[PDB]
Write a protein that binds this ligand. Structure first.
Ligand SMILES: COC(=O)c1ccccc1S(=O)(=O)NC(=O)Nc1nc(C)cc(C)n1
Ligand SMILES: COC(=O)c1ccccc1S(=O)(=O)NC(=O)Nc1nc(C)cc(C)n1
Lengths: 349, 349
């Protein structure tokens, strides 16, 4: 159960670009304090870790953390149980885990000067945003309010400090450049499966439309829905009559159609309400967001697709949060992922 | 051999504190855009990865990256060869790699507002500093000027982009809080050996004075020297007759004396000039910095210690950069680390 046998492991950087400061670099002049003079900076590169089993079977999996997270969430649960990285190497797949540009070991583009600014150019915004513990608690559906847990909870209660410590801010790197780095990784790896989460859901759908090597997608609790341009369906506002879900991403139909060529599964945990819930903003947000995803999957299927929505409670798993792959039943969640890979032959050579 | 057999692996967060925004959190109100209202933020925590072999021998090793780096540098070289993590798990040690607070998967303390600012409080400075490619090239002694290599260089040429992509800024978290996180890790681990690098050199020395579990230190190319308070020896300026090395860190002699109780080795690569070199600021900086460290080690030995300076060229290894553990001969560098561990019984149970 904890033992893992690796034919090889390692990490590397991929993607990104360079930006430059003014002037020329003189090696005879004091190098410290650092200057933008004569400077070349590498920005927006992505960190990638890989672990390959002996005699892998089927396609490599690329695990893509959600918003404000890192590859840690696939390594271990907050209470130190094996994450999906270990579980899937044991299941004979080569496993890639990434820290996308702007997160963890990915690049945070800043220089000498106010955060994100290279002389007169704003690479990323100096003003940041970041969730609180309280905002994350309700976002991830630990309970309806901070400190509270849903009755059926699979959260590793007692490890709240570990869990919230894994979360942080993201600088304003364009989503285009985040997608670009993962497209480059997919080109490097070859045929593979993307396993996404929350904010990376929409990004992985975009990658698949740019990269035929994506042979399947499993998206845990995706945060933003995707539709063909001009064909976003009517989506209701939230129960507070004022808020809405995240504006759906729209792509050209030629690209959207590529989503119909591969198996796609969206996976949702528990405690998303059926009915409007004005007292709990994020619970209601999830209700309408899941609804929008159901319509997005239907649009894919009408174009010939193989898109499905898996509600974990319907599979007999109760109490999952928005991070089902780190919950107490994450081994059963992993079993359902293995089932999907087996159904489509993505676990065979 | 790239193969590794792990009895267990994983990662966790340790250390840090919390800061709070004003006001109250209302779950009925829109949670996004994120707000500091009612907010608790976890700040300055550290990420820790571990890999344990089957039947470990001796003490666990804690690999601590240098300035602007992450645990990536111990995982793989820029050209994809195994890093010290793999080499030492194969050498039957449990291996811990960290991303210290402010770097990689460690926390970057920022909120909703200008970078590093929580309402009226500056947690870290909004203005950042960061080396350029050019500054890092000369800092790490790839050659005397950017784009030029020493003839004897052990750097993995052709993988320059990959190498510089691993480097980034650090927010202004106090060194006290970085040391605090590692002291807490050392308390958690038990007896262990610190393996440091550059900026982490002085920090590891400080950790040892606070944590009796540190049973040995190997420091690759440490950047800041350490002395008892009031006993900093005369250190010359640089050849430019204007610049100085990093101000040596001073600690109370009762803490400094703890450094005499454990074996300590500082390891330096090649191409550090013996004589004043005014044309090449960072080469001359290393000349005087290495000299200051020699004096520091001497001070430890005058207190009954066992502190040594290992110049890799004297051991038959030519051309090493300031990252000997990722250079082309990093297996031979690793062998010298094994030799130190074996001499001092740190590879025995
Ligand atoms: C792991 O949890 C999630 O991934 C996740 C899950 C659900 C919702 C949101 C996220 S998030 O963290 O990615 N946060 C954001 O998307 N931030 C954000 N989005 C918009 C549209 C506007 C603003 C101001 N902030
Ligand atoms: C990997 O390379 C190094 O670690 C490394 C190696 C040599 C010199 C500097 C660094 S650095 O990157 O840490 N850069 C810094 O800016 N450090 C620093 N600067 C000041 C002004 C004071 C102090 C104490 N440290």
């Amino acid at each position: 159960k904890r033992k893992v046998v690796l034919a090889e492991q390692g990490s590397f950087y991929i993607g990104g670009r360079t930006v430059t400061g003014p002037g020329k670099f003189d090696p005879s002049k004091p190098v410290i304090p650092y200057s933008n003079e004569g400077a070349t900076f590498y920005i927006n590169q992505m960190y990638v870790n890989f672990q390959a089993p002996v005699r892998p079977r089927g396609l490599p999996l690329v695990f893509w953390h959600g918003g404000g997270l890192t590859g840690h969430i696939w390594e271990s649960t907050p209470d130190g149980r094996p994450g999906f990285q270990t579980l899937f190497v044991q299941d004979r797949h080569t496993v890639y885990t990434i820290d996308q540009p702007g997160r963890g070991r990915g690049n945070i583009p800043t220089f000498n000067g106010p955060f994100g600014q290279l002389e007169e150019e704003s690479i990323v915004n100096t003003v940041t945003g970041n969730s609180s513990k309280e905002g994350a608690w309700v976002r991830d559906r630990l309970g309806p309010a901070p400190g509270q847990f849903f009755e059926n909870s699979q959260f590793p209660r007692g490890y709240e400090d570990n869990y919230f410590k894994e979360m942080g801010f993201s600088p304003s790197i364009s989503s285009d450049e985040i997608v670009d780095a993962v497209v480059k990784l997919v080109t490097h790896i070859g045929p593979c499966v993307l396993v996404t989460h929350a904010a990376s859901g929409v990004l992985g759908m975009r990658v698949a439309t740019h990269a035929k090597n994506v042979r399947g997608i499993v998206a845990y609790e995706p945060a933003t829905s995707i539709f063909p341009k001009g064909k976003v369906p009517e989506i209701p506002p939230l129960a507070d009559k004022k808020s809405q879900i995240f504006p759906p991403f729209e792509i050209q139909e030629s690209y959207f159609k590529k989503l119909a060529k591969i198996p796609i599964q969206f996976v949702f945990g528990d405690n998303i309400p059926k009915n409007p819930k004005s007292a709990y903003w994020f619970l209601d947000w999830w209700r309408v967001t899941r609804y929008a995803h159901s319509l997005s999957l239907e649009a894919i299927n009408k174009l010939g697709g193989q898109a499905s929505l898996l509600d974990l409670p319907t599979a007999g798993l109760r109490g999952n949060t928005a991070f089902p792959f780190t919950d107490r039943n994450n081994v059963q969640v992993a079993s359902l992922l293995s089932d999907f890979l087996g159904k489509h032959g993505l676990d065979q050579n």
